[PDB]
C-alpha cells in the first residue's frame, strides 16, 4: 500500500483505489496501473521532472528504503492476475530489488522528487509506475 499527495491530489495504484478515490475520480489509467483522486487536504509531496535512472525506494516487505537503478519508461508485459488479464503495463520502470505484491504503493524518490510508485515485481525485480510525464499533477 501507498499514495503520493500533491497538491490536491492522491495518486494511488490503480488496483489499490478504494470506493471514495472513484466517488471522487480525476483520471485513471487502466493500462499504467494508476489512478488520481482529489483531496481536500494538501499533500506535502513534489513530483520529479527529470530523466533520472537511479533513486531510492520503500520496500514495505523488508522495512527497508533500497537505492536503485531502473530502466526508463516502457511498455512490459505483466502477467495475468485478479486484477487484470495478461497485458502490456505502459510507462512501466524496472529494476533489480526486492519486492512482494503488498508493496504497491512504495515510493520512489530521485534528487528532484517523487518518480513512481511500486507496481509490478518479479524474482529479484521491481517495477515502478512512472508519475514524472503527468505534467497536470503540478497545476489545476
Ligand atoms: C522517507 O521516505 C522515503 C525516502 C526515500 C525514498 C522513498 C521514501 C518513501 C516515501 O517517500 N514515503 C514512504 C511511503 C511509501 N508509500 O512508500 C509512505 C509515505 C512517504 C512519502
Ligand atoms: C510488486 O508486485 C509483485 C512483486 C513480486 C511478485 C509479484 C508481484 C505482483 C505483481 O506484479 N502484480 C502486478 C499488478 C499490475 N501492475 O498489473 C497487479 C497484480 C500484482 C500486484
Ligand atoms: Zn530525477
Known amino acids: 500500500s501507498g499514495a ?21 475520480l480525476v483520471w485513471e489509467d487502466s493500462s499504467r496501473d494508476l489512478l488520481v483522486s482529489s483531496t481536500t487536504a494538501q499533500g506535502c509531496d ?6 533520472c535512472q537511479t533513486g531510492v525506494y520503500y520496500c514495505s516487505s523488508r522495512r527497508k528504503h ?11 508485459f505483466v502477467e495475468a492476475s485478479e486484477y487484470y488479464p495478461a497485458r ?3 510507462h512501466l520502470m524496472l529494476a ?11 515510493i520512489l524518490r530521485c534528487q528532484h522528487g517523487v518518480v513512481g510508485i511500486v507496481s509490478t515485481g518479479g524474482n529479484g525485480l521491481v517495477g515502478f509506475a512512472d508519475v514524472r510525464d503527468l505534467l ?5
Open 46 to 51: 513534489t513530483i520529479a521532472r527529470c530523466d
Open 136 to 140: 497536470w499533477l503540478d497545476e489545476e
Open 88 to 90: 502490456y503495463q505502459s
Open 4 to 24: 503520493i499527495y500533491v497538491g490536491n491530489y492522491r495518486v494511488v495504484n490503480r488496483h489499490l483505489a478504494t470506493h471514495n478515490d472513484w466517488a471522487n
Open 96 to 106: 533489480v530489488g526486492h519486492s512482494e505484491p503488498g508493496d504497491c504503493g512504495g
Open 66 to 76: 533500497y537505492p536503485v537503478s531502473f530502466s526508463k519508461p516502457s511498455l512490459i
